RNA sequence: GCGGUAAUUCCAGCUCCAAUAGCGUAUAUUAUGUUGCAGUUAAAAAGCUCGUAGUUGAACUUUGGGCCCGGUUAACGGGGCCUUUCCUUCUGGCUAAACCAGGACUUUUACUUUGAAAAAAUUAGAGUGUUCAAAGCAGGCGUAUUGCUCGAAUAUAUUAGCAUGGAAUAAUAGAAUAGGACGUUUGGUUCUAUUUUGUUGGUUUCUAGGACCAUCGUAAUGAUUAAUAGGGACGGUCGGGGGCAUCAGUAUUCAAUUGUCAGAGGUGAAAUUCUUGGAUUUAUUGAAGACUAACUACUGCGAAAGCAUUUGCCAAGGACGUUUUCAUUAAUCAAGAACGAAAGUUAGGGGAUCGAAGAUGAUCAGAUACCGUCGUAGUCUUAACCAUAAACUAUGCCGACUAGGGAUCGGGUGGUGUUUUUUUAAUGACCCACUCGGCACCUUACGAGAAAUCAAAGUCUUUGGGUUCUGGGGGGAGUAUGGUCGCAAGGCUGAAACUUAAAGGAAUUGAGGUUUCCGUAGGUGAACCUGCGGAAGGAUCAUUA
RNA sequence: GGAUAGUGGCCUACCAUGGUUUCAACGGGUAACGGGGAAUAAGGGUUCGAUUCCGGAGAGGGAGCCUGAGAAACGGCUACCACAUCCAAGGAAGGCAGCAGGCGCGCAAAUUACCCAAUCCUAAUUCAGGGAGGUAGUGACAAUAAAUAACGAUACAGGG
């Protein structure tokens, strides 16, 4: 389709730390499903 | 002598050559594309929430992850605390069987092993 | 082709000193090679050199008497500021009580210590120890 | 070594360490000038004036005797051609090999050598047009080169 | 009860150790190369050459000497003079175009020094007992009843712009058709007047300042070498370099004719096959296409692929020799382009041999000793394509230096050296010595390397001559998508998701089949077989020299 | 020429065909506000900088405007889009990326506190106002100093 080189960003480390913290926040929302 | 040019007015060639060549390094590519955390078992996270699916060898349990849905094995330290997880428990796991049980039902396993807290049911 | 006659002269001097020769011949000649060899000769790293005059470029025969470790050029001739001299000195010399780096400044071709004493800086040319 | 070959030969002449007056000559200093221009009027380009002058009349070079080069002497009297000597001979060789290639279409060695000769002509013509002895464009092409050389 | 347990130690008790108002855990990270990586074999030098931009590029033009003053520890550093040397644009004076006080200048740059500047906080840092400290900018001293007083420094700021000193280093321009510089050498054109003839409008002369056209001079009147760089010319060589034409040599197959009998081929052992209309063999002759044996070598030529019969023609080339020419024209190379084994593709040609596919023989534990006959395309060529190889020296190209020896190819130099002339004169061949340019070889380590090994794979932890290309674990994979080229086959570019950590590799020493591959084409038992071309990443003994 | 506070293809009528680029134009991506600064280094580099200061932009998303020296202002106005409040069903009203505070998962994180005393800002103005700002409260962000003991007598174990 296209190249992964072209769809890149200006800051690697900020992506790394914000993405790790956002993954932690997103897995904080997970639960065991039951019925209301 | 060496492969690289060494002119006074040849900084452009060196900079362009370095820019071209850094893409062949694995760390550079996986840190610019943001896909370096898919090789980790957790994904981008450091802990993963899971469902206690079965009690397994004797110390470990079989726990299904809630995010992706695949089932792994979990290490429960202080083998007596094996009986704190019962069935379908909501656990929070960290890497160590490459996994281990850290936080069961919101509270930590060290607060239950030392009888600091009690499990909310 | 020949891009720097000073590099060839210093490579010939280094090889002649390493194999253990007493004197070496250098072709072509230059004013910069003559001045650089005088800068070596003042601190005794070489012996005595003589200029043979054919009409083409001249040749230089240098009589060596030991106590030469390593001499070379730094190509390209970078622009070295007056605070930047000790950076090169620490980068490409073995110690501090021996070893000279050599600069062509607007006051001529001289080693780094005379450049400090005259408070003048310019382009790098090479080194000797 | 060579510009268009792997050869690295050093076969050349060695001019002596004497810029004035070979002692056994004692002939003249200006007679060689009209001898040279008579040879040029005969239809000769400066290389064989030099060769025939050192082979027959004993002049080692015109620089040491007359104090002037042969091409500057011929240009001083207005006998210089439009194109210089070596470019003329390169165009002549290219025209001959192009005629041969026109007769023989399957001579790929002649193709390669024609490309080499034409690139050499391009380099020398660029140098001549930079120093401005040629017209500033001069447009080298084979169709006009065939009429230009002969 | 003992011992063992792929219990990746299964669990509790005693003891000690680390840090401490703090300590642990999970995940991420630390312990690409300008400086400063590697490319023979571990990943990697485009198959080769040309070539634009880019990057890089031989030497050379004022050095040397004397004089003082003159700052700092006999030394280091500064300026003015003279040594043919201080060069320019003008106001005021000493004067008789030649000096003094003064307003200013890199022909154009790059470079470097110095200075203005550049915001506070932050950084470094001076002073100061906030009870110490992190800090903060405070504070300190007295007759402590009318007071006094030190501070709140300093450094840095790495580009671009501004000012300034230097002129090495690296570029650029000037006099070659003199259309060049300089003048109390003269005429003419063309313009403007700060004025005086009362201010002004216009007419003119004188006078003053410019530019221009021709003539007399003033002068050392103006051109750096000619790179063991390059291209060009010339002399004689040299070669299995190329194209066209032509000639020859056996051989293979086929055909004709003649001889004679029972077999000929083939393989480990058979069979199909031809054969008493004569197979095979023998003898004479002819045709077809292909290929150039022996000579053939650790020889030669070409950019590589590659190139071997004779002779002729056409154009080309290397090395040598030259007291020949021009004077930097050069090196490497994105764009772009020429050539490019074999196989393969579209047409025309003849098609001998060999021969993928195919048709057929027997499959006998063992095929170790997996074959036989016929044979299409192809093999050869013309006109167009394709553009890949273990395209290998697995070693880019240009330049220099560094170690001993013997051969050998081409050119050149010397030999009251040899031989053939039929007279010992040129030449040819041989020998000896030297030299330039090659193909390689033997030993060694000055060195290099992880090692095998290397005269470069050396001149490197003491690291810089210029330049191009490539690589940054292995599969997935040169696969998928997109683009471009190709009639196709396919070529160029070129990923990711997932997976391995007892994973991939380089060199050396401690039931059957078994050479390993590469480019290409075709077909299926057992991921194999076969056709063309290429490599060793495979183990040179005996004789002679 | 119009318009502007004013230059200007800012816009209009006419006339030319130009302008940029392999020294990378143009298009695309950016989890891209920029700088002072921060960290790791011996140096070069590499990474971060939403955030105490300076500059820019925005006030749910477009678009337009009044007033005024200064706004294309949103704790100003008008209309469109999306949300959304009130009711007697005719109509009216809205904008926390200000300070508190709440929702956004059924797995969680500061006080809907006090005051203009300080620093400054505003006005007609010493006087009023200021969730700007200060004060206290609150999860060990980070950081500094520092308690939880010191001196003995007696019996054994010692070096003796």
From Swiss-Prot, chain A:
It is found in: Cytoplasm; Nucleus, Nucleolus. Interacts directly with RCL1 and the U3 snoRNA to form a stable subcomplex. Component of the 90S small subunit processome also known as 90S pre-ribosome that consists of the 35S pre-rRNA, early-associating ribosomal proteins most of which are part of the small ribosomal subunit, the U3 snoRNA and associated proteins. Belongs to the TRAFAC class translation factor GTPase superfamily. Bms1-like GTPase family. BMS1 subfamily. GTPase required for synthesis of 40S ribosomal subunits and for processing the 35S pre-rRNA at sites A0, A1, and A2. Controls access of pre-ribosomal RNA intermediates to RCL1 during ribosome biogenesis by binding of RCL1 in a GTP-dependent manner and, via its affinity to U3 snoRNA, delivering it to pre-ribosomes. GTP-binding and/or GTP hydrolysis may induce conformational rearrangements within the BMS1-RCL1 complex allowing the interaction of RCL1 with its RNA substrate. Required for RCL1 import into the nucleus. This is Ribosome biogenesis protein BMS1. The lineage of its organism: Eukaryota, Fungi, Dikarya, Ascomycota, Saccharomycotina. The gene is BMS1.
From Swiss-Prot, chain B:
It comes from the Eukaryota. Transmembrane segments: none annotated. One of its GO terms (cellular component) is ribosome. The stereochemistry of the 3,4-dihydroxyproline has not yet been determined. The keyword Zinc-finger does not apply. GO terms for biological process: maintenance of translational fidelity; maturation of SSU-rRNA from tricistronic rRNA transcript (SSU-rRNA, 5.8S rRNA, LSU-rRNA); regulation of translational fidelity; translation. Keywords: Cytoplasm, Hydroxylation, Isopeptide bond, Ribonucleoprotein, Ribosomal protein, Ubl conjugation. CDD domains: Ribosomal_S23. GO terms for molecular function: structural constituent of ribosome. It is found in: Cytoplasm. Its main location: cytoplasm. There is a cross-link at residue 55 (Glycyl lysine isopeptide (Lys-Gly) (interchain with G-Cter in ubiquitin)). Component of the small ribosomal subunit (SSU). Mature yeast ribosomes consist of a small (40S) and a large (60S) subunit. The 40S small subunit contains 1 molecule of ribosomal RNA (18S rRNA) and 33 different proteins (encoded by 57 genes). The large 60S subunit contains 3 rRNA molecules (25S, 5.8S and 5S rRNA) and 46 different proteins (encoded by 81 genes). Present with 10600 molecules/cell in log phase SD medium. Belongs to the universal ribosomal protein uS12 family. NCBIfam families: PRK04211.1 (NF003254), uS12_E_A (TIGR00982). This is Small ribosomal subunit protein uS12A. The gene is RPS23A.
Swiss-Prot record, chain C:
PROSITE patterns: RIBOSOMAL_S8. It comes from the Eukaryota. GO terms for molecular function: structural constituent of ribosome. GO terms for biological process: cytoplasmic translation. Keywords: Cytoplasm, Ribonucleoprotein, Ribosomal protein. One of its GO terms (cellular component) is cytosolic small ribosomal subunit. Its main location: cytoplasm. InterPro entries: Ribosomal_uS8, Ribosomal_uS8_CS, Ribosomal_uS8_sf. HAMAP family: Ribosomal_uS8_A (MF_01302_A). Belongs to the universal ribosomal protein uS8 family. Component of the ribosome, a large ribonucleoprotein complex responsible for the synthesis of proteins in the cell. The small ribosomal subunit (SSU) binds messenger RNAs (mRNAs) and translates the encoded message by selecting cognate aminoacyl-transfer RNA (tRNA) molecules. The large subunit (LSU) contains the ribosomal catalytic site termed the peptidyl transferase center (PTC), which catalyzes the formation of peptide bonds, thereby polymerizing the amino acids delivered by tRNAs into a polypeptide chain. Present with 40400 molecules/cell in log phase SD medium. Component of the small ribosomal subunit (SSU). Mature yeast ribosomes consist of a small (40S) and a large (60S) subunit. The 40S small subunit contains 1 molecule of ribosomal RNA (18S rRNA) and 33 different proteins (encoded by 57 genes). The large 60S subunit contains 3 rRNA molecules (25S, 5.8S and 5S rRNA) and 46 different proteins (encoded by 81 genes).
UniProtKB/Swiss-Prot annotation, chain D:
One of its GO terms (cellular component) is cytoplasm. Pfam families: Ribosomal_S13_N, Ribosomal_S15. PROSITE patterns: RIBOSOMAL_S15. GO terms for biological process: cytoplasmic translation; maturation of SSU-rRNA from tricistronic rRNA transcript (SSU-rRNA, 5.8S rRNA, LSU-rRNA). GO terms for molecular function: small ribosomal subunit rRNA binding; structural constituent of ribosome. The keyword Ion transport does not apply. Transmembrane segments: none annotated. The keyword Ubl conjugation applies. It is found in: Cytoplasm. InterPro entries: Ribosomal_uS15, Ribosomal_uS15_arc_euk, Ribosomal_uS15_N, uS15_NS1_RNA-bd_sf. The modification Phosphoserine is found at residue 31. Keywords: Cytoplasm, Isopeptide bond, Phosphoprotein, Ribonucleoprotein, Ribosomal protein, Ubl conjugation. Its main location: cytoplasm. SMART domains: Ribosomal_S13_N (SM01386), Ribosomal_S15 (SM01387). There is a cross-link at residues 38, 42 (Glycyl lysine isopeptide (Lys-Gly) (interchain with G-Cter in ubiquitin)). Component of the ribosome, a large ribonucleoprotein complex responsible for the synthesis of proteins in the cell. The small ribosomal subunit (SSU) binds messenger RNAs (mRNAs) and translates the encoded message by selecting cognate aminoacyl-transfer RNA (tRNA) molecules. The large subunit (LSU) contains the ribosomal catalytic site termed the peptidyl transferase center (PTC), which catalyzes the formation of peptide bonds, thereby polymerizing the amino acids delivered by tRNAs into a polypeptide chain. PANTHER family: RIBOSOMAL PROTEIN S15P/S13E, SMALL RIBOSOMAL SUBUNIT PROTEIN US15. Belongs to the universal ribosomal protein uS15 family. NCBIfam families: PRK08561.1 (NF006331). This is Small ribosomal subunit protein uS15. The gene is RPS13.
